[PDB]
Amino acid sequence: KLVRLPGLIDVHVHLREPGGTHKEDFASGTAAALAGGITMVCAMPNTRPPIIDAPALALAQKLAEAGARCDFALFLGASSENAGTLGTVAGSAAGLTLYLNETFSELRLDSVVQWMEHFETWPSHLPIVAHAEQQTVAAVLMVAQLTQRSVHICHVARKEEILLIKAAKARGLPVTCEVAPHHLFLSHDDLERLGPGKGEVRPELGSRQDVEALWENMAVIDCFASDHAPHTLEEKCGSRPPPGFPGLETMLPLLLTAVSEGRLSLDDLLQRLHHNPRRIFHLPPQEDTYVEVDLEHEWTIPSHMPFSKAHWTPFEGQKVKGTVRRVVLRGEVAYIDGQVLVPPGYGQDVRKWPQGAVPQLP
Amino acid sequence: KLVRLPGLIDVHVHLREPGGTHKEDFASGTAAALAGGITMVCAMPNTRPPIIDAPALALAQKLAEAGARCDFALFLGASSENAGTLGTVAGSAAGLTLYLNETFSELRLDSVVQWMEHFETWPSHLPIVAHAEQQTVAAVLMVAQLTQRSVHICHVARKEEILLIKAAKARGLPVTCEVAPHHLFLSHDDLERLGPGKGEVRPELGSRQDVEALWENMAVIDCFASDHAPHTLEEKCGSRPPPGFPGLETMLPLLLTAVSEGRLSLDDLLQRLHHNPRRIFHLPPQEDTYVEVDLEHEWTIPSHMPFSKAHWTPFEGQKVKGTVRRVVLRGEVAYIDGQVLVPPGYGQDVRKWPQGAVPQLP
Ligand SMILES: NC(=O)N[C@@H](CC(=O)O)C(=O)O
Numbered sequence: 001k002l003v004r005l006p007g008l009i010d011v012h013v014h015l016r017e018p019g020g021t022h023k024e025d026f027a028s029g030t031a032a033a034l035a036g037g038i039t040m041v042c043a044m045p046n047t048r049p050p051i052i053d054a055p056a057l058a059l060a061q062k063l064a065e066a067g068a069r070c071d072f073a074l075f076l077g078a079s080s081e082n083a084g085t086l087g088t089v090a091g092s093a094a095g096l097t098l099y100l101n102e103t104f105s106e107l108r109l110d111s112v113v114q115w116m117e118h119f120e121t122w123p124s125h126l127p128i129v130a131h132a133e134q135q136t137v138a139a140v141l142m143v144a145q146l147t148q149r150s151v152h153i154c155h156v157a158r159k160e161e162i163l164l165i166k167a168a169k170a171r172g173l174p175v176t177c178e179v180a181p182h183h184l185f186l187s188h189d190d191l192e193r194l195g196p197g198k199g200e201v202r203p204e205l206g207s208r209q210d211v212e213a214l215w216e217n218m219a220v221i222d223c224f225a226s227d228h229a230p231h232t233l234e235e236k237c238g239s240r241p242p243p244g245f246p247g248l249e250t251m252l253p254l255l256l257t258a259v260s261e262g263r264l265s266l267d268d269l270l271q272r273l274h275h276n277p278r279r280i281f282h283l284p285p286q287e288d289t290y291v292e293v294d295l296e297h298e299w300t301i302p303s304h305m306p307f308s309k310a311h312w313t314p315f316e317g318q319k320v321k322g323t324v325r326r327v328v329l330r331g332e333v334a335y336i337d338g339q340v341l342v343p344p345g346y347g348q349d350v351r352k353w354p355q356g357a358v359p360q361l362p
Numbered sequence: 363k364l365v366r367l368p369g370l371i372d373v374h375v376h377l378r379e380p381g382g383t384h385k386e387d388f389a390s391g392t393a394a395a396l397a398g399g400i401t402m403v404c405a406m407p408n409t410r411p412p413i414i415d416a417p418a419l420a421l422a423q424k425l426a427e428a429g430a431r432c433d434f435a436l437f438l439g440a441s442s443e444n445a446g447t448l449g450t451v452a453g454s455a456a457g458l459t460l461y462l463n464e465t466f467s468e469l470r471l472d473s474v475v476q477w478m479e480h481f482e483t484w485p486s487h488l489p490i491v492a493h494a495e496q497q498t499v500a501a502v503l504m505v506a507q508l509t510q511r512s513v514h515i516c517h518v519a520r521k522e523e524i525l526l527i528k529a530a531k532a533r534g535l536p537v538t539c540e541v542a543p544h545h546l547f548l549s550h551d552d553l554e555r556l557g558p559g560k561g562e563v564r565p566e567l568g569s570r571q572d573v574e575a576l577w578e579n580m581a582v583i584d585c586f587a588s589d590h591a592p593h594t595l596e597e598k599c600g601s602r603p604p605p606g607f608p609g610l611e612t613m614l615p616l617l618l619t620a621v622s623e624g625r626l627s628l629d630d631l632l633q634r635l636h637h638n639p640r641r642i643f644h645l646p647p648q649e650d651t652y653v654e655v656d657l658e659h660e661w662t663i664p665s666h667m668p669f670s671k672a673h674w675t676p677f678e679g680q681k682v683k684g685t686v687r688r689v690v691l692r693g694e695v696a697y698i699d700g701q702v703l704v705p706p707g708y709g710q711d712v713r714k715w716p717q718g719a720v721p722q723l724p
Pocket residue numbers: 014046103104131200201202203227229230242243244245
């Protein structure tokens with residue numbers, strides 16, 4: 001007997017198109033999404049060219065409309081030069097992404113004053129997400145309060161970070177956050193097996209105490225999001241390994257295993273992969289869309305999943321219980337038992353739907 | 363220029379059918395809902411007969427399907443005799459309602475052991491809401507922890523209650539809550555004008571400090587809900603006045619006034635009248651459904667609103683800014699500038715929709 005879930009949403013993926021299409025493209029990344037029970041993705045802007053102005057966004061929109069197999073929204077990225085220039089296209093994006101630490105990106109902001117400028121000029125009703133680690137979480141929360149608006153913290157990975165966010169929420173501050181599966185299911189104990197190249201990720205893998213702190217503070221976690229960050233094995237094992245793990249195809253099976261073990265409820269999972277993503281990013285419903293999962297099937301994660309061009313996974317050898325059997329997207333069968341059945345281009349930009357615009361005061 | 367909102371949801375209404383149809387019926391109450399920008403309502407079970415067993419639910423379903431103009435779900439009510447008997451129909455209801463204090467209801471539970479029995483026998487994946495005032499909020503939270511599940515607190519009205527819920531949320535406990543408009547916009551200062559009959563409501567009107575505490579702790583409030591509780595003026599002004607205010611037609615105009623004054627944001631309002639109702643009660647989206655409001659129009663609340671059979675309102679004479687211009691429900695114009703344009707019976711039971719069932723483990 002299968003369980004029917006709504007269409008799940010991943011608010012943090014890297015689809016690498018344009019400019020890194022040997023790692024992933026819209027067609028291969030959205031195939032990975034559908035196979036992981038994900039029917040809508042929000043794509044980060046750290047591509048080549050990065051999505052930091054209107055021409056780059058226009059190019060990315062057309063590439064996604066032609067290649068995506070599931071529905072999507074595209075983030076804009078903050079730069080040292082584009083504050084105050086995005087007003088005409090801001091509403092067409094998933095939100096604005098601030099890169100506040102070192103990671104796979106050249107979108108460096110090197111002064112808090114630049115963060116302030118973005119918080120002041122970006123329209124106040126639209127989402128802002130931040131790559132902000134350790135004390136940077138406190139710093140960006142300060143900038144959000146100075147400018148009297150909300151912020152969403154990407155991939156929280158540490159006891160320090162989740163407890164700071166917990167304290168902010170207790171004071172009534174408008175902050176939300178997401179946690180990626182590798183920070184719930186991997187730790188320092190796995191670095192010997194992975195090695196220093198494969199093991200490179202930002203935020204880095206945490207201690208066992210970090211992992212335990214995230215589970216203990218699940219009530220503080222608003223969303224799960226994969227931070228699907230594909231790189232080839234050659235790149236991961238080469239002289240200057242880029243950080244990041246692929247994760248779309250393994251996220252839901254890992255979390256279904258935890259549900260089966262009683263670590264969180266099915267509702268806890270659906271809040272964090274459906275309802276809270278919808279409400280934080282004002283993402284629209286998807287008509288006639290659902291995911292059927294088999295919670296009984298036991299299997300072991302192989303050395304690579306079928307669809308991501310990354311062609312490797314850090315979860316190799318983990319035993320999971322739960323698998324995606326079928327996905328229906330807007331009335332068409334999109335995935336069944338390892339076969340993707342919608343072509344590149346089937347997916348649409350949800351911000352162009354009338355119900356996908358963020359409401360605002362005139 | 364109008365602002366387009368999604369279809370708003372009121373998780374706490376009394377439609378009085380069956381058995382009190384001089385006060386309201388499905389047709390008049392859902393007309394009031396549409397005029398207030400509400401496209402989906404959850405109807406409480408304290409009717410005559412009350413909805414406390416399968417035959418009563420079956421009757422109510424048919425009355426609602428024939429009379430409702432907007433979509434709906436129907437609560438079941440807990441009684442001193444029906445714990446352990448609702449399993450076959452539980453999934454067809456909005457949730458289970460516990461009456462834990464004195465109010466317009468004979469569904470008295472007179473022992474905490476009866477509360478325990480309901481929390482243990484009601485399916486653990488389905489909603490429970492509680493009428494629980496003052497220390498009763500702490501008591502029902504204790505029962506929820508003993509039985510390891512969530513609870514939703516109806517119409518929070520006091521500083522004492524919102525601060526207790528705030529403390530529970532800080533400890534990670536699964537509790538949500540709703541606040542009704544009369545507890546944000548009326549107080550003891552209005553009791554002289556209303557008089558002792560009209561002024562009767564449960565929870566009673568609060569002090570100015572109670573009202574200020576609710577606004578200061580808006581981050582703790584998950585939902586707004588009208589607690590639309592219609593009684594005729596004759597009843598309100600007679601020898602034994604029943605408690606309750608009508609509120610569907612005045613809720614959104616009052617809150618839009620507050621938005622216009624900067625007391626909360628448009629997003630704050632849509633979280634509390636759309637996204638959080640959806641996610642707490644697992645309510646489905648409504649296709650091709652939206653509400654158009656005019657935020658500029660200034661007007662004064664009259665002595666009665668056009669649609670509710672209550673034919674009175676406690677907000678008479680309050681100046682508001684904001685009004686509902688048009689409502690579209692599932693592709694049909696349902697309301698325009700004071701005219702309801704869908705007939706009784708247009709509305710549907712959302713728990714019969716495939717997307718309206720609450721997901722559960724097999
Ligand atoms: N997380 C990573 O380690 N890498 C991400 C970037 C990011 O999310 O910071 C990537 O784009 O490769």
